[PDB]
A = this chain, B = another copy of it.
Amino acid sequence: LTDTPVMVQICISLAQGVVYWQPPAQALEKVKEIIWEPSVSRYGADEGLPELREALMQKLGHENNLHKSSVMVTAGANQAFVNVVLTLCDAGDSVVMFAPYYFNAHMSFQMTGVTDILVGPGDPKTLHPDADWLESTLKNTVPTPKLVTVVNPGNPSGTYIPESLLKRISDICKKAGCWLVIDNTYEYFMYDNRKHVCIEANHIVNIFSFSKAYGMMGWRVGYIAYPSEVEGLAAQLLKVQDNIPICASIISQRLALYSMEMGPEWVTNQVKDLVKNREVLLEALSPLGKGAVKGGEGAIYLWAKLPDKYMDDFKVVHWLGVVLIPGSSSGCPGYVRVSFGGLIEKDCRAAAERLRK
């Protein structure tokens, strides 16, 4: 077996981060009507269904205020991230993530022979990525890291990146001449009127997913909004895209398009029903102490520190009848992740999360 992957890292449920709702019935209804079209069974353009790309172009402009980005539909945001790594990183290059980091992004770097991953700290009080650390790291790391990855709002932190902070990291990356890769999988999942914002530049690539917003997890559709004016970028993405998925499933792309037509409010109105899921689980995490739990700013995650000697999450998780996610996988051992987006007021039976000590 190969060097590169062998050293790549490996009851009510509160584990995998999903939503409980299905895609829009009216969008599913439109899909029902087109299954016999021959185009649905044929290869589509690698870049995605033209109608879908166009709907996404309009969405990026009017919802995210992006006007200089092109779209490539991918078979998921996870495959979209792989496209970017293979296009923006060489094996042996260095990259920067922030703790706690998105687990699959970490593995995806390693998997493609990018093993020098510099994991920076977040503000101890808010878990927001330390921009001072990054700016100093980029100045003092030789050779300069090729790209920086952040998730806004965060997985697993459940915290978001303020507009001011987001632009500073962007500015830091611009002088240093490296890429900024922002995963917007949870853009529609904001709480307490906190604002998700998107920014663009010839050194910024944004990644999105339909999986959580529209409950289309099993359908596997996501997309890349990349700078239109960066020479040869589109061509490299085409190369990686043709080799891995060729194209996203046509029927999945159709559903994405039809789900989109409901509008953003279809999603955010359902996110509101999750606020009560949060409050229940936050009070269920009371035995841990007063400032032990963070997050609840965005996405669907709560980030909690287990007792000081319990730095071994796997044993704590196995000993629990509720399923949590070990925080060590995100680079922070001794912590644990709680997802409140996947249950329908069966979340209170999930509040059987004993935490006896």
A89 to B4, CA, bound (A): 8
Q: How many residues of A contact B (CB 8 A)?
A: 94
With a cutoff of 8 Å between Cβ atoms, the chain B residues found around residue A10 in the complex are: 33, 235, 238-239
Question: Does A57 belong to the interface (CB within 8 Å)?
Answer: no
Question: Does A149 belong to the interface (CB within 8 Å)?
Answer: no
Contact with B along A1-44 (1 / 0, CB 8 A): 11111111110000010100111011011011101111111111
With a cutoff of 8 Å between Cβ atoms, the chain B residues found around residue A244 in the complex are: 78-79, 82, 244
Question: Does A240 belong to the interface (CB within 8 Å)?
Answer: yes
Contact between B90 and A177, CB atoms less than 8 A apart: no
Question: Does A111 belong to the interface (CB within 8 Å)?
Answer: yes
Known contacts A1-B232, A40-B218, A249-B220: A32-B29 contact under CB 8 Å: no
With a cutoff of 8 Å between Cβ atoms, the chain B residues found around residue A119 in the complex are: 33
Stretch at the interface among A129-137, A158-166, A193-201, A331-339: A331-339
Question: Does A246 belong to the interface (CB within 8 Å)?
Answer: yes
Interface residues in A220-242 (C-beta closer than 8 Å to B): 220, 232-233, 235-236, 238-240, 242
Question: Does A284 belong to the interface (CB within 8 Å)?
Answer: no
Contact between A249 and B246, CB atoms less than 8 A apart: no
Chain A residues within CB distance 8 Å of chain B: 1-10, 16, 18, 21-23, 25-26, 28-29, 31-33, 35-44, 75-76, 78-79, 82, 86-91, 93, 104, 107-108, 111-113, 115, 117, 119, 142-143, 146, 177, 215-220, 232-233, 235-236, 238-240, 242-252, 269, 273, 276, 308-309, 311-312, 328, 331-334, 344
